[PDB]
Amino acid sequence: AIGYVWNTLYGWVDTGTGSLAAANLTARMQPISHHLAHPDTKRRFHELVCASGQIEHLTPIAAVAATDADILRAHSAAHLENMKRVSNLPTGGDTGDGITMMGNGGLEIARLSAGGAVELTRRVATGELSAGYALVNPPGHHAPHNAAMGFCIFNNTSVAAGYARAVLGMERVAILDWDVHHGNGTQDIWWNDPSVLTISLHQHLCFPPDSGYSTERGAGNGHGYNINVPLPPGSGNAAYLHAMDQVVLPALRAYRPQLIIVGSGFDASMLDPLARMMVTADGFRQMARRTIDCAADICDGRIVFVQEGGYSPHYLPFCGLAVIEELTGVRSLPDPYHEFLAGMGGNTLLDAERAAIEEIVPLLADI
Numbered sequence: 311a312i313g314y315v316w317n318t319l320y321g322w323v324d325t326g327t328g329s330l331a332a333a334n335l336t337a338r339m340q341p342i343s344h345h346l347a348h349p350d351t352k353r354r355f356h357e358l359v360c361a362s363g364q365i366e367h368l369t370p371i372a373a374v375a376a377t378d379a380d381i382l383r384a385h386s387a388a389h390l391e392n393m394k395r396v397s398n399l400p401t402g403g404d405t406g407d408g409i410t411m412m413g414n415g416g417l418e419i420a421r422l423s424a425g426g427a428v429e430l431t432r433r434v435a436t437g438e439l440s441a442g443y444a445l446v447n448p449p450g451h452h453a454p455h456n457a458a459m460g461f462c463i464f465n466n467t468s469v470a471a472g473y474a475r476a477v478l479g480m481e482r483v484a485i486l487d488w489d490v491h492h493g494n495g496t497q498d499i500w501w502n503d504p505s506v507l508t509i510s511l512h513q514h515l516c517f518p519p520d521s522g523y524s525t526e527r528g529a530g531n532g533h534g535y536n537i538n539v540p541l542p543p544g545s546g547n548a549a550y551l552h553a554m555d556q557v558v559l560p561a562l563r564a565y566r567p568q569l570i571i572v573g574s575g576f577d578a579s580m581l582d583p584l585a586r587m588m589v590t591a592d593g594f595r596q597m598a599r600r601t602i603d604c605a606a607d608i609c610d611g612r613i614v615f616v617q618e619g620g621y622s623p624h625y626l627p628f629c630g631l632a633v634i635e636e637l638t639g640v641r642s643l644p645d646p647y648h649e650f651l652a653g654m655g656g657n658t659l660l661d662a663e664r665a666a667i668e669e670i671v672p673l674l675a676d677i
């Protein structure tokens with residue numbers, strides 16, 4: 311039994327008329343119909359899940375709105391009120407950073423997104439479901455304790471981990487983030503806390519700026535329980551898999567969490583505009599396979615995938631379907647881009663990719 315969350319409203323997120331920042335007449339930034347982060351990309355993933363027949367092998371899980379209490383396990387009271395404030399606006403607006411807009415009443419979607427991750431987590435921890443994928447939107451991993459950041463209103467995976475901790479009585483949770491951008495928000499929230507291990511693989515210095523160095527390791531009792539794996543631009547399947555086997559899986563095995571949550575972004579894909587990595591659907595399949603198999607060994611298979619980024623409306627759906635096919639064990643479709651992307655490279659571990667991954671190995675000893 312594999313849980314699956316999609317709520318119609320995830321496809322209704324209002325990203326405005328700009329590309330990234332707002333449309334801007336002085337700067338001569340022409341309005342456009344599809345902002346980089348337009349919800350269509352993730353809706354296409356859902357429709358592919360359905361049209362492929364994969365949905366026949368899933369157990370649909372209705373999202374429940376994250377309460378104020380759920381949100382406060384990961385965020386400050388000032389953050390929550392500010393988001394209520396912004397959501398009350400006639401056309402809503404920018405949440406603070408200039409690129410993260412909430413539409414009017416947008417808070418309802420932000421609660422359903424966080425809440426989808428919570429509900430899926432609850433039913434897996436219960437033993438109703440062995441595992442699941444929550445295809446939520448807006449994403450979560452850039453939102454720190456006290457802010458919205460980089461399209462993220464609330465930190466979905468941290469709301470879920472906070473629920474696993476406080477309500478389900480779990481002692482140890484791991485959050486593995488393979489969205490191509492640094493999970494700065496998740497790092498921030500659990501910084502001082504050894505009871506949540508946070509692992510981020512990312513393109514070095516992609517987003518946020520000046521963030522996600524390997525020297526960011528947590529603090530206090532949480533020192534040694536934040537792991538960053540910054541990778542050079544151009545890294546593909548070989549680099550990601552090397553990183554899985556040499557860093558991620560050993561970290562997880564050393565840590566012994568009771569639940570693995572995956573911040574699952576597909577913006578490391580070969581065709582993504584918002585990074586320069588070369589991962590293909592098979593790369594993501596192989597990453598999902600190894601993490602699921604790891605979960606089966608160390609925490610009775612309790613693994614929850616939660617949607618993060620990815621900006622290719624053409625390719626993301628097939629990267630996403632590959633991960634769901636690994637959960638259900640049922641293959642629906644080939645990757646119709648495979649032969650096209652195959653010759654492009656990324657499948658060889660380059661010396662500089664190896665050196666980047668080898669820098670993190672010593673950190674394993676402190677877990």
Ligand SMILES: O=C(CCCCCCC(=O)C(F)(F)F)Nc1ccccc1
Pocket residue numbers: 330409449450451452460461462489491516517519575577584618619620
């Ligand atoms: O770099 C950006 C774009 C942010 C990229 C957003 C990545 C978000 C995700 O993939 C996720 F949605 F959070 F998962 N903006 C920016 C950064 C610094 C100065 C001015 C603008």
Ligand SMILES: [K+]
Pocket residue numbers: 487488489490491492493510511512
């Ligand atoms: K990441």
Ligand SMILES: [K+]
Pocket residue numbers: 500501502503504505506507508528532535536
């Ligand atoms: K931590």
Ligand SMILES: [Zn+2]
Pocket residue numbers: 489490491575577618619620
């Ligand atoms: Zn991203």
